[PDB]
Design a protein around this ligand. Structure first.
Ligand SMILES: [Mg+2]
Ligand SMILES: [Mg+2]
Ligand SMILES: [Mg+2]
Ligand SMILES: [Mg+2]
Lengths: 57, 36, 219
RNA sequence: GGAGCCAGCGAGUCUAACCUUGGCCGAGAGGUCUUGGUAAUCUUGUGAAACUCCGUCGUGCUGGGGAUAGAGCAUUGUAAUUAUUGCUCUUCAACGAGGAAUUCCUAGUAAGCGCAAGUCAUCAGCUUGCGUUGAUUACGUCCCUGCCCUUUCCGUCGCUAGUACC
């Protein structure tokens, strides 16, 4: 495509187009139910990204 | 030309002339305007 | 107030205009020139085959012409309109958008060429008044009160809409019929000198890469 | 196919790699070694084209037409066997002057021919500018059409004042 600029550009330069992409909120709901568990103190839900990566190495 | 056609159309609908020379529902007249 | 360049002859000497086109004009551009001649009462169309800008302006200045109109196109689509005022400018350049020629209308008929009434609207800024003064002086002065022809330049967001209408005074209202053409002309450059003088100082120019251009108004 | 052969407007490299002469290599495209120019100084006389002379061809969709397609030789990036822009060969179509209609045009004008810059709008085989060759016909009329100007000429009903009438 053809483009016009306020001033002459050099071949080494890099042109960029700014744009915005919509993002959505994840509908995840995990209530804590410690009282229903035998131990009542080791409830575990979705793990952190770091923890997951460490587990899979 | 355009002016001659325009004047003739108005005269046909009685838009031009006199009120005093001696030789309709206002909504209906509005319909006549829109057609012109 | 009328500009200094025009103040000397403002309302004194009837404007003399030459309408022309670029080299090797297309048929549509040649057509497009024709109504511009018909638009201005005192315009004469001149075939520009091989004429030279120093030669053209010098010959025109000798003949006593007031303004020179040159037209540019792109595949038979009118694109630009430049008006240069003699003997020493100013030169105003415009871009034509959504151009609608009268040849596009079937059974259109012939124009009336009386001295037309002029309508300029929404011109408030100082630059706007300059545009009014430049355009205002292309036409003949003192139109007849019963002159049946009206030319309107309506400024809407820096885009000057141009229309040509003929009216009739009826008992309860006035009914206007447009004769054409329709085109929107935007000022994008203005110089203090003839179109030939490429080095003439630029009084004003349109900045398009400034960040506020998308919302900026000038006229 | 050879030979002759002539313009103008412009553009062009600093904390860079632009216009590029000349030499060599390459069928070409292009490659390579140098060189002048920040430019009325070098590219550049931009040795442009059309155009002229001598030759081949010969009324045959033919040596007109070059659409479509195949195979190769190179440039550009980039790491793909990706595209990109050039050249070589082959392939060789519709098209034999174009209905009804329709648009424009009066002198360096219609028309043909190339060169340069893409310098805030628009433009990318498109815009603008520059230059070369250069015509036929008309330059008279309101007869038809259309648009105006003048009667600071003639009719109808008006409006103002008055007189009476039904
Ligand atoms: Mg031509
Ligand atoms: Mg052109
Ligand atoms: Mg050309
Ligand atoms: Mg004549």
């Amino acid at each position: 495509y053809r483009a016009a600029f306020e001033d002459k550009i050099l071949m080494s330069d890099i042109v960029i187009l700014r744009s915005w992409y919509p993002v959505r909120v994840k509908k995840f709901y995990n209530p804590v139910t410690s009282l229903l568990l035998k131990e009542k103190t080791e409830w575990k839900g979705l793990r952190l990204t770091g923890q997951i990566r460490a587990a899979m190495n | 030309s355009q002016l001659k056609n325009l004047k003739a159309a108005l005269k046909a609908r009685g838009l031009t002339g006199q009120t005093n020379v001696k030789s309709y529902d206002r909504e209906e007249k509005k319909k006549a305007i829109a057609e012109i | 107030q009328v500009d200094d360049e025009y103040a000397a002859t403002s309302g004194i000497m009837d404007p003399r205009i030459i309408v022309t086109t670029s080299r090797d004009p297309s048929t549509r551009l040649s057509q497009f020139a024709k109504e511009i001649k018909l638009l201005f009462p005192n315009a004469v169309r001149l075939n520009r085959g091989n004429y030279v800008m120093p030669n053209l302006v010098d010959a025109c200045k000798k003949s006593g012409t007031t303004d020179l109109v040159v037209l540019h196109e792109h595949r038979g689509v009118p694109t630009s309109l430049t008006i240069s005022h003699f003997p020493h400018g100013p030169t105003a350049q415009f871009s034509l958008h959504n151009v609608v020629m009268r040849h596009d209308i079937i059974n259109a008929g012939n124009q009336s060429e009386v001295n037309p009434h002029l309508i300029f609207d929404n011109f408030t800024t100082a630059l706007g008044k300059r545009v009014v003064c430049i355009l205002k002086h292309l036409f003949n002065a003192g139109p007849k009160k019963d002159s049946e022809r009206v030319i309107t330049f309506a400024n809407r967001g820096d885009f000057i809409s141009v229309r040509q209408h003929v009216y009739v005074r009826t008992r309860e209202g006035v009914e206007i019929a447009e004769v054409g053409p329709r085109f929107e002309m935007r000022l994008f450059e203005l110089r203090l000198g003839t179109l030939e003088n490429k080095d003439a100082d630029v009084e004003w120019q349109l900045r398009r890469f400034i960040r506020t251009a998308n919302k900026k108004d000038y006229l």
